[PDB]
Structure formats: structure tokens, C-alpha cells
Design a protein around this ligand. Structure first.
Ligand SMILES: NC[C@H]1O[C@H](O[C@H]2[C@H](O)[C@@H](O[C@H]3O[C@H](CO)[C@@H](O)[C@H](N)[C@H]3O)[C@H](N)C[C@@H]2N)[C@H](N)[C@@H](O)[C@@H]1O
Ligand code: NI
Length: 275
């Protein structure tokens, strides 16, 4: 593919603060059927440039750690973006279109409880197909309780490790489908591949991906010369237990008391996001 598939894609400008009813209906219809929705033209260059720069500037500190935290296989580094006041942007944390969709899917009490990132390094390995958040009981069909909000901080290409997604996989929860790490058992993977094979496609910087937290996906090798930073948030239902995001009380004024909710603990000092 050369672009996000039309059936998963809704196009916007950074000026759009709400989806009209027909746009919201299509957004919800895509998330319900495919478990993944690509929103193009959401974020200004000004914001993505500063976040990209901050995360690449922090990568050296991350690679110096005694144990570099990875997801599954070499080269998929867990990296939190900074929570400096200067790098906490309302249009990223409290995006009005993102929360319009998450409010409609999860309810008005839904809250962001993740402010993290995935730095995919040059020469990274293939992750096993997994879900980031499990089904709440084995062998049970239930609606979503969490939505991953993924912000690419550079153009994602097939070369630099755009994520493999398995459309419609978010509703699959037969017995002995998942292991303790959330990896899909091989038997189920092959059966699914027959009827609905995975897709991988470019995603331009400025885009936002909203997906069911239970969607099957894998990180894949970054074959470029440059690390591929993703900023990651996750909206949960009110009743799902999550630790709070540590934020500086310098952002409490606009974060706390907003009707788009964040599970946050506000600290007096600077926060150390890296450990
Ligand atoms: N899309 C955002 C992020 O999603 C995932 O991070 C998740 C964990 O996966 C999840 O853990 C779940 O899975 C574990 C192992 O399967 C189980 O032990 C655990 N009980 C179960 O809650 C935590 N609750 C929250 C964390 N933010 C990815 N790792 C990461 O790449 C990505 O940035
Ligand atoms: Ni994952």
C-alpha cells in the first residue's frame, strides 16, 4: 500500500475541533468493524516537530540505561516523551476530535492513563503478533474498554517500521487464543490470516491512529537509518484500574477540570519521565 486504506481513513485539517454527525458515525463504524481508524491532518508541524526533536534528544539517555526496556524483541525501545510544561500540548493530550470519538465509544467518563512512546530503532527485529490490552475474560465477547491513540512523530513508511495491523481482530477472543504476554497463539493467527489478512501502510506525520486496545498488531523492522518515534496514549473506561500519569502541577490548571479526562497525579517539582 502507498497510503492508509480509504475504508480505515478519515481526513481532517488541524482547524477541525469536532466531527459533524456523519463523520462521527463513520469514525465509530470503522472502529466497531475494523478496530482501527486513521485520522489524517490532525496535528500541526509545529507540535510534531517539537515532540520528534525532544524524543530524539532523549534517546541517548535511554540507550545509556543498564537495562534498555524493549517490547518483545531487540530495537523496539519503550520511551516516555517529556512532561515538561513547554512540551505538553492541549491538542496532543486533550485533542477535541480524539475525545469526541473516545467519549462516544467508552463514555463521557473515559480517561487518558498513558503518555508513553515506542522508539523503533534501525535494524529492529519482528515482534510477535500481540494485543497491547487483553480481553477481560477468556472466551467472552464484550465491547471495547480502551482505545490506543498513536501519534507518529515522523512519516511512517513500509521501510521505517509502520505497524502491521490485523483489521477486525479486536472482537476475537476464543479459548486459548492468548498467552500471558498477550501474544496470539499460532493456530488462531493462521485461521484468521485465511479470512482477513493483516495490512501495513504509510501514515504521514500529522496523523492520529485510534484503535481498539485488543487489536492484533506487530512492530516490524525499521530498515531506515533513523529511529522511528511513536507517541502513545490510551483512553480507558472509568472503572479500569490504571496508575496515574505523573504531570507537573504547572499544567494542572488546564489538564484538571477539563471535560476530557486524564488520570493524572500533579507533582510540585519537575518530573523525571525517563526513570
Ligand atoms: N498502546 C500503548 C502501549 O500499549 C502497551 O503497553 C501497555 C501494556 O501492554 C499493558 O499491559 C497488559 O499486557 C501485559 C503483558 O501482555 C499484562 O501483563 C498486563 N496485565 C496487561 O494490562 C499495560 N496495562 C499498560 C501499558 N501501557 C505496549 N506495551 C506499548 O508498546 C504501547 O505503547
Ligand atoms: Ni503492541
Amino acid at each position: 500500500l502507498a497510503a492508509p486504506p480509504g475504508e480505515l481513513t478519515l481526513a481532517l485539517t488541524p482547524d477541525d475541533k469536532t466531527l459533524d454527525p456523519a463523520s462521527l458515525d463513520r469514525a465509530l463504524a470503522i472502529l466497531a468493524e475494523h478496530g482501527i481508524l486513521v485520522l489524517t491532518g490532525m496535528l500541526r508541524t509545529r507540535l510534531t516537530d517539537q515532540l520528534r526533536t525532544a524524543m530524539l534528544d532523549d534517546l541517548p539517555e535511554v540507550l545509556r540505561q543498564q537495562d534498555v526496556p524493549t517490547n518483545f524483541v531487540p530495537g523496539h525501545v519503550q520511551q516516555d516523551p517529556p512532561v515538561r510544561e513547554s512540551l505538553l500540548f492541549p491538542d496532543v493530550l486533550l485533542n477535541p476530535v480524539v475525545y469526541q470519538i473516545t467519549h462516544a465509544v467508552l463514555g463521557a467518563d473515559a480517561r487518558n492513563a498513558v503518555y508513553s512512546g515506542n522508539m523503533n530503532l534501525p535494524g529492529s527485529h519482528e515482534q510477535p503478533v500481540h494485543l497491547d490490552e487483553p480481553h477481560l475474560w477468556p472466551g467472552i465477547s464484550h465491547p471495547p474498554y480502551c482505545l490506543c491513540v498513536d501519534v507518529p512523530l515522523i512519516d511512517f513508511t513500509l521501510e521505517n517500521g509502520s505497524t502491521e495491523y490485523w483489521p477486525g481482530s479486536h472482537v476475537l477472543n476464543p479459548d486459548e487464543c492468548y498467552d500471558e504476554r498477550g501474544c496470539v497463539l499460532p493456530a488462531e493467527l493462521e485461521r484468521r490470516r485465511a479470512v482477513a489478512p493483516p495490512v501495513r501502510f504509510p501514515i504521514p506525520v500529522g496523523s492520529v491512529v485510534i484503535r481498539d486496545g485488543r487489536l492484533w498488531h506487530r512492530g516490524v523492522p525499521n530498515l531506515s537509518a533513523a529511529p522511528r518515534p511513536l507517541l502513545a496514549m490510551t483512553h480507558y473506561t472509568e472503572w479500569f484500574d490504571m496508575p496515574p500519569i505523573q504531570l507537573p502541577d504547572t499544567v494542572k490548571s488546564w489538564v484538571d477540570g477539563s471535560d476530557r479526562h486524564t488520570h493524572a497525579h500533579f507533582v510540585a517539582g519537575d518530573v523525571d519521565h525517563l526513570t
